[PDB]
Amino acid sequence: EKHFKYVILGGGVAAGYAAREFAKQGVKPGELAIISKEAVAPYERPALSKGYLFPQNAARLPGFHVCVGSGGERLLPEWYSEKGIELILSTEIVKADLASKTLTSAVGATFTYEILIIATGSSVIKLSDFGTQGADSNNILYLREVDDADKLVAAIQAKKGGKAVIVGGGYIGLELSAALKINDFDVTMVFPEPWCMPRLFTADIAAFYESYYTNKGVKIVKGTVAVGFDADANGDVTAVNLKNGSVLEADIVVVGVGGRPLTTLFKGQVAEEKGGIKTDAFFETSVPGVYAVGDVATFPMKMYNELRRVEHVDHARKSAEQAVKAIKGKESGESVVEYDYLPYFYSRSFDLGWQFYGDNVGDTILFGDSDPTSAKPKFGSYWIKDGKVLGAFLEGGSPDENKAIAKVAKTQPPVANIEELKKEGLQFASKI
Ligand SMILES: Cc1cc2nc3c(=O)[nH]c(=O)nc-3n(C[C@H](O)[C@H](O)[C@H](O)COP(=O)(O)OP(=O)(O)OC[C@H]3O[C@@H](n4cnc5c(N)ncnc54)[C@H](O)[C@@H]3O)c2cc1C
């Protein structure tokens, strides 16, 4: 049995950013442990569907450990040993008893704590969850952690020049479809929703991306689902059977159909809402001294005055920092202010890259040049409600442009003249 004053359960983005904040807050050797099922120290997970998959000059650990994806210092394994923060890796916790402050591993070792930060993130929804025949076939792959990324890069090499089907139409599907096309596969994306990234993109933003993708040669099948997967005599996938009747040949299937927060360990022990563990503005759960951060947390989003749960890397970083600040504040009796996050999401694929800030609520206007055949695409959109801007999206922005739309989203300026807005959208944002 090992005991630590502070235990972070999980070794992902929030964990890493929490450890950096504990360092900043003066954690001492022997106080903090991070327990992770992964075999490696915390890393910037968005690289797994971006540089990890590049056919040249690919991202590889230890390059993309935290905190370099935000421009911070890199926290190698030796950084945690130098600080006397114990990294307990390749350790899956399979039971948590909050009353006794005890975690148990799959092999039966126990760990106790005084303060617990739940930073377990999400697991992916699987094709078995849709009851799909043949979901269990080989070469049907998911992408959440670096072990998954290595299996994908190995299949890319094994099946080079083949056919790939990507199931899903959110931003993981978009990034995967683009990765496989860049790695020289024939690619088809399949999803039921009426356009890609339907929880964020408008039909007009989506039509840009869908057009750009088809111009790159990616096929897009919307309005259907897979109902089966054919497999050969080795159990390896060979074809995807769709509800619309089409049969797509496939050497590799890669799935991005969403995730689920990893809250099962705590079911019945903490209050839950919106698919997550409910927290206050300091990331403390219904059990004192147990906090929940990142993808699992359902928290008060101060600027919207509503409880929300978000799966954004920026929030994993910032909520981690907030929870450690709150922990340390309570020790010293020093106050900490309520978390005040501005939603920030981004994605990249091919040569494109977009950023979104604020809330996708209201009616939209598009600005700039949304011809997908442009040399250097650059266009955005505003979400307007009650005559003010609530959300902003930008593809192809400079740093100052991105900062300006972030300031629009944060400040919610009023719109006088829509035709001016639309004709000079970024100038609008720069004057704020
Ligand atoms: C492939 C990919 C690409 C992404 N791209 C972007 C992007 O471009 N932009 C963006 O804003 N966001 C993106 N995200 C989302 C972002 O990475 C997540 O929001 C962020 O990782 C959440 O951080 P977290 O610490 O809450 O969870 P995670 O980073 O998932 O960390 C959870 C950690 O806990 C471990 N763990 C879980 N259960 C246990 C257990 N019982 N025992 C031990 N350890 C356990 C996991 O193995 C993992 O180490 C992407 C995510 C993925 C998967």
Q: What is the CATH number of the domain that holds 384?
A: 3.30.390.30
Residues 115 and 262 in one domain: yes
Residues 272 and 388 in one domain: no
CATH number at residue 137: 3.50.50.60
Does 156 belong to an annotated binding site? Answer: no
3-state DSSP call for residue 330?
Answer: helix
* Spatial CA neighbour of 47 closest among 319, 295, 344, 348: 348
Ligand 1 atom at shortest distance from the alpha carbon of 143: 1
How distant is the alpha carbon of residue 23 from its chain centre?
A: 25
Resolution of the experimental model, in Å, one decimal: 1.7
Burial of 305 (0-12, 13-18, 19+ CB in 10 A): exposed
Pocket of ligand 1 from Cβ distances under 6 Å: 10-15, 35-38, 45-46, 48-49, 92-93, 119-122, 143-145, 172, 262, 294-295, 311-314, 316, 345-347
CB contact at 8 A, 370 and 379: yes
Does 175 belong to an annotated binding site? Answer: yes
How distant is the alpha carbon of residue 189 from its chain centre?
A: 20
Residues 204 and 307 in one domain: no
What lies within 8 Å, CB to CB, of 169 at 6+ separation is 189, 190, 191, 192, 193, 195, 196, 197, 198, 222
Residues 26 and 81 in one domain: yes
Candidates 175, 295, 317, 319: which one to mutate for ligand 1, based on the most atoms within 8 Å of Cβ? 295
Q: How far apart are CA 233 and CA 414, in angstroms?
A: 63
Phi-psi region of 121 (alpha: psi -120 to 50; beta: other; left: phi over 0): left
Q: How far apart are CA 3 and CA 6, in angstroms?
A: 9
How distant is the alpha carbon of residue 429 from its chain centre?
A: 27
Q: How far apart are CA 180 and CA 161, in angstroms?
A: 10
Does 27 belong to an annotated binding site? Answer: no
Burial of 391 (0-12, 13-18, 19+ CB in 10 A): buried
Last residue of a domain, one of 343, 374, 397: 343
Find the 40 Cα to ligand 1 centroid distance in Å.
13
For tokens 């995967």, the residue is 176
285 backbone dihedrals φ, ψ, rounded to 5° = -80, -175
Q: Which token pair is 427?
A: 């100038």
Does 396 belong to an annotated binding site? Answer: no
Q: Which token pair is 412?
A: 């919610």
Q: Which token pair is 277?
A: 């563990």
CB contact at 8 A, 395 and 206: no
For tokens 């040949």, the residue is 249
Find the 376 Cα to ligand 1 centroid distance in Å.
32
User: How far from each other are the two terminal CA atoms of the chain, in whole angstroms?
Assistant: 56
* Spatial CA neighbour of 149 closest among 169, 124, 185, 168: 124
Q: Which token pair is 420?
A: 């001016």
Q: How far apart are CA 320 and CA 283, in angstroms?
A: 9
Find the 56 Cα to ligand 1 centroid distance in Å.
25
Q: How far apart are CA 126 and CA 257, in angstroms?
A: 7
Q: Which token pair is 243?
A: 């509800």
Single-letter residue type at 371: D
How distant is the alpha carbon of residue 113 from its chain centre?
A: 28
Residues 286 and 398 in one domain: no
Among protein residues, the one with the nearest Cα to ligand 1's atom 7 is 46
Q: Please state the domain count of the chain.
A: 3
Q: Which token pair is 82?
A: 């130098």
* Spatial CA neighbour of 177 closest among 378, 369, 347, 33: 347
Residues 169 and 280 in one domain: no
* Spatial CA neighbour of 396 closest among 432, 355, 430, 367: 355
Q: How far apart are CA 359 and CA 270, in angstroms?
A: 28
Ligand 1 atom at shortest distance from the alpha carbon of 35: 43
Q: How far apart are CA 16 and CA 34, in angstroms?
A: 9
Single-letter residue type at 292: A
Last residue of a domain, one of 293, 315, 343: 343
Residues 175 and 295 in one domain: no
DSSP3 helix / strand / coil % (the chain, rounded to 5): 30, 30, 40
Find the 259 Cα to ligand 1 centroid distance in Å.
10
Q: What angle do CA 150, 155, 156 make, to 5 degrees?
A: 95
3-state DSSP call for residue 333?
Answer: coil
3-state DSSP call for residue 69?
Answer: helix
Residues 141 and 249 in one domain: yes
Find the 375 Cα to ligand 1 centroid distance in Å.
34
Containing structural domain, residue 360: 344-432
Does 51 belong to an annotated binding site? Answer: no
3-state DSSP call for residue 237?
Answer: strand
Last residue of a domain, one of 236, 257, 278: 257
Residues 330 and 359 in one domain: no
Does 199 belong to an annotated binding site? Answer: yes
Q: How far apart are CA 265 and CA 96, in angstroms?
A: 6
Residues 144 and 249 in one domain: yes
Among protein residues, the one with the nearest Cα to ligand 1's atom 2 is 46
Radius of gyration over alpha carbons of the chain, in Å?
A: 22
364 DSSP assignment: E
Ligand 1 atom at shortest distance from the alpha carbon of 91: 43
Residues 161 and 226 in one domain: yes
Residues 225 and 338 in one domain: no
- H and E: helices and strands count for the chain: 9, 26
